[PDB]
Amino acid sequence: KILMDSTHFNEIRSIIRSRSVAWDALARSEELSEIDASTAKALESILVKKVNGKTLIPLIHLLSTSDNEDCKKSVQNLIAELLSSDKYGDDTVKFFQEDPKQLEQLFDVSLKGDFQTVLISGFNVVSLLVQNGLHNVKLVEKLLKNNNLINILQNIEQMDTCYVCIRLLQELAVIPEYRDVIWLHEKKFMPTLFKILQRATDHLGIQLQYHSLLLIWLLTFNPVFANELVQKYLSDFLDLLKLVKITIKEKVSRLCISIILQCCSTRVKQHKKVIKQLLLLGNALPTVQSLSERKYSDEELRQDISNLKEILENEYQELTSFDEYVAELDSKLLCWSPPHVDNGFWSDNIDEFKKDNYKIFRQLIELLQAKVRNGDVNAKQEKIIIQVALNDITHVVELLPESIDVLDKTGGKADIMELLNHSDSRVKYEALKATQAIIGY
Amino acid sequence: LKADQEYEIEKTNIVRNETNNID
């Protein structure tokens, strides 16, 4: 196979070889012809253990004729073994390149039959398509569109199948047309990649995560695909940074750093906007600063981390605390930021809050109302957000009290009164402080 | 390898822009 050295590929090959059907037995059961049985036996002796060569077509015909699951698994295992073998496999790939019918038959066999047989056939097809002559974007797209490949990729319990699929996609990503096919497959099944990234942030799993990161980086190598994936998941950069911080593998960290840099690279559209959004939401600057302080054995990973830190510092140089506050308000997430407790920041941003007919004040009132509606859950994060919103409202009422009338009109006083009866002691204290700042002494 | 591949694509695009300038 193309990546038969992987543990998942070896396990799939062993599973396929477990269900083995003899060529003579298939011929006896009218599942193959005598010449086809002889060709299958020769191929089995050559690979499973003489090369079939031109006889591989009779073996494929016998496999098609033998619809039994055991025979299909045996044929797939033999094909995978031939692909792994240096002498065999290459001849089959050359024959498929010369005759597109053989390549089409191999693609149809891929991701078909039994799960082990489907995996072995897909690995054989990937190995055949690894050659430049036999490479075909249409065959790769057809194999990816198969339900078996999607099930293997989404098989959380079957980590080996997901790792094999990710490795196959990463290997196919070298060819630009196959790279576009892999990008389309990623756009279709981004949920599997997101789940893998979340699992890595929170072995077979490590290899699968590394393969997924490599595939993501290969897709992001194209600026258009990187720009498309940037808006696909705003938290993807934060998840990648968390996984890189958690993971100690140098290769995984380097791949994550390269993927993060590609999204913020100048080649991708809206590079400055993407970098600013990442730094505002995922705290790219602090994570990069922490990574720079930490020592990394890999020189390439260290250089990538240094470049990412420099990019984050350059992006944050133009940004200010007002941009961070705006991003926090847009994300509706507040955890008692330094600007909330900074008297100078509130004094210098009081006019900004009241600007545009108190647009920021209206947004804060809407966030407080949403938190009050979400106050039934009374989650710790929700309680912290509610307390931060109450503190911001109290500050905006104490300074430039014109916003107090707007808040009262928009039900801010009613929201504060409702929060005054909240079960949480901190929320009740914050609401009482806001009420005291409103009309109290 | 991915970074080098992206550089080759960007380098080819720069040469492609030169062809438009040559045109």
Question: Given an 8 Å threshold on Cβ–Cβ distance, is A221 in contact with B10?
Answer: no
CA–CA separation, A414 and A98 (whole Å): 77
CA distance B22 to chain A (A): 23
CA–CA separation, A404 and A396 (whole Å): 8
Q: What is the dihedral angle through the alpha carbons of A360, A363, A364, A370, rounded to the nearest 10 degrees?
A: 180
Task: Give the helix/strand (H/E) hosting B3.
Answer: helix B2-22
Collect all residues of chain A within an 8 Å Cβ-Cβ radius of residue B5: 174, 221
CA–CA separation, A371 and A427 (whole Å): 11
Taking a C-beta distance cutoff of 8 angstroms, is the pair A96, A115 a contact? no
Using CA coordinates, name the residue in chain B closest to A217.
B2
Question: Given an 8 Å threshold on Cβ–Cβ distance, is A267 in contact with B2?
Answer: no
Residue B1 DSSP SS3: coil
CA–CA separation, A398 and A14 (whole Å): 72
Taking a C-beta distance cutoff of 8 angstroms, is the pair A77, A122 a contact? no
Collect all residues of chain A within an 8 Å Cβ-Cβ radius of residue B6: 221-222, 262, 265, 267
Scored b (16 or more CB within 10 A) or e, A72-97 reads bbbbbbbbbbbbbbeebbbebbebbb
Question: Given an 8 Å threshold on Cβ–Cβ distance, is B6 in contact with A262?
Answer: yes
Q: Find how far residue A46's CA is from the centre of its chain.
A: 40
Interface check B5 vs A, CB under 8 A: yes
CA–CA separation, A275 and A397 (whole Å): 34
CA distance A173 to chain B (A): 10
In a mutational test of the A interface, the residue from B1, B4, B5, B6 whose CB has the highest number of chain A CBs within 10 Å is B6
Interface check B3 vs A, CB under 8 A: yes
Cα distance between the two ends of chain B: 33
As to burial, measured by CB atoms within 10 angstroms (0-12 exposed, 13-18 middle, 19+ buried), residue A195 is: middle
CA–CA separation, A124 and A76 (whole Å): 8
As to burial, measured by CB atoms within 10 angstroms (0-12 exposed, 13-18 middle, 19+ buried), residue A6 is: buried
Question: What six digits make up the tokens of A343?
Answer: 């008297």
This structure's resolution (Å) is 3.3
Taking a C-beta distance cutoff of 8 angstroms, is the pair A48, A89 a contact? no
Question: Given an 8 Å threshold on Cβ–Cβ distance, is A221 in contact with B5?
Answer: yes
Interface check B6 vs A, CB under 8 A: yes
Using CA coordinates, name the residue in chain A closest to B5.
A221
Q: Find how far residue A258's CA is from the centre of its chain.
A: 14
Give the method of determination: cryo-EM
Q: Which residues have C-beta within 8 Å of that of residue A163, sequence separation ≥ 6?
A: A6, A8, A204, A207, A208, A211
Amino acid at site A175: I
Q: Could you write out the three-class secondary structure of chain A?
A: CCCCCCHHHHHHHHHHHHCCCCHHHHHHCCCCCHHHHHHHHHHHHHHHCCCCHHHHHHHHHHHHHCCCHHHHHHHHHHHHHHHHCCCCCHHHHHHHHHCHHHHHHHHHHCCCCCHHHHHHHHHHHHHHHHCCCCCCHHHHHHHHHCHHHHHHHHCCCCHHHHHHHHHHHHHHCCCHHHHHHHHHHHHHCHHHHHHHHHHHHCCHHHHHHHHHHHHHHHHHHCHHHHHHHHHHCCCHHHHHHHHHHHCCCHHHHHHHHHHHHHHHCCCCCCHHHHHHHHHHHCCHHHHHHHHHHCCCCCHHHHHHHHHHHHHHHHHHHHCCHHHHHHHHHHHCCCCCCHHHHCHHHHHHHHHHHHHHHHHHHHHHHHHHHHHHHHHHCCCHHHHHHHHHHHHHHHHHHHCCCHHHHHHHHCCHHHHHHHHCCCCCHHHHHHHHHHHHHHCCC
Q: Which residues have C-beta within 8 Å of that of residue A384, sequence separation ≥ 6?
A: A334, A335, A336
Q: How many CA atoms lie within 13 A of A178 on its CB side?
A: 22
Phi, psi of A293 (to 5 degrees): -65, -40
